[PDB]
RNA sequence: UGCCUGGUGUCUUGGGUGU
């Protein structure tokens, strides 16, 4: 569909970052809280993006 | 009684399942952080599915 | 006049209960 599903949109060029409501953090104990799995995966993705940008230039 | 009754001693044993350890009710209470639905468990004042 | 408190992990696993 030209308006809604264009074929080139199947390739990701910009990634949407969900709000913390989607990936809430949990307090494992009284002091240390735990980052969610999605948060760690997004951190890894962003590190890889930074690495690619640094290497390219 | 018009009917005679079978009558005698028998060995009975009390099992761990008592009603006061199973009765549970909930009007409102804690909810999960991710889904904002009632938590699971009688010990946590949870809801029924 | 000294004045009262609501806020509860998560993920696995195991053993059970009623059909």
Automatic annotation (TrEMBL), chain A:
It is found in: Nucleus. Transmembrane segments: none annotated. It comes from the Eukaryota. DNA-dependent RNA polymerase catalyzes the transcription of DNA into RNA using the four ribonucleoside triphosphates as substrates. Belongs to the RNA polymerase beta' chain family. This is DNA-directed RNA polymerase subunit. It comes from Komagataella phaffii (strain GS115 / ATCC 20864) (Yeast).
TrEMBL record, chain B:
Coiled coil: none annotated. It is found in: Nucleus. It comes from the Eukaryota. DNA-dependent RNA polymerase catalyzes the transcription of DNA into RNA using the four ribonucleoside triphosphates as substrates. Component of the RNA polymerase II (Pol II) complex consisting of 12 subunits. Belongs to the RNA polymerase beta chain family. This is DNA-directed RNA polymerase subunit beta. It comes from Komagataella phaffii (strain GS115 / ATCC 20864).
């Amino acid at each position: 569909n030209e308006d809604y599903a264009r074929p080139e949109w199947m390739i990701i060029t910009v990634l949407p970052v969900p709000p913390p409501q989607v990936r809430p953090s949990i307090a494992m104990d009284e002091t240390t809280q735990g980052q969610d799995d999605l948060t760690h995966k997004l951190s890894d993705i962003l590190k890889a993006n930074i690495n690619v940008q640094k290497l390219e230039m | 009684l018009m009917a005679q009754v079978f009558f005698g001693p028998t060995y009975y044993q009390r099992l761990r399942h008592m009603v006061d350890d199973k009765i549970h009710a909930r009007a409102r209470g804690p909810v999960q952080v991710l889904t904002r639905q009632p938590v699971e468990g009688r010990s946590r004042d949870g809801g029924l599915r």
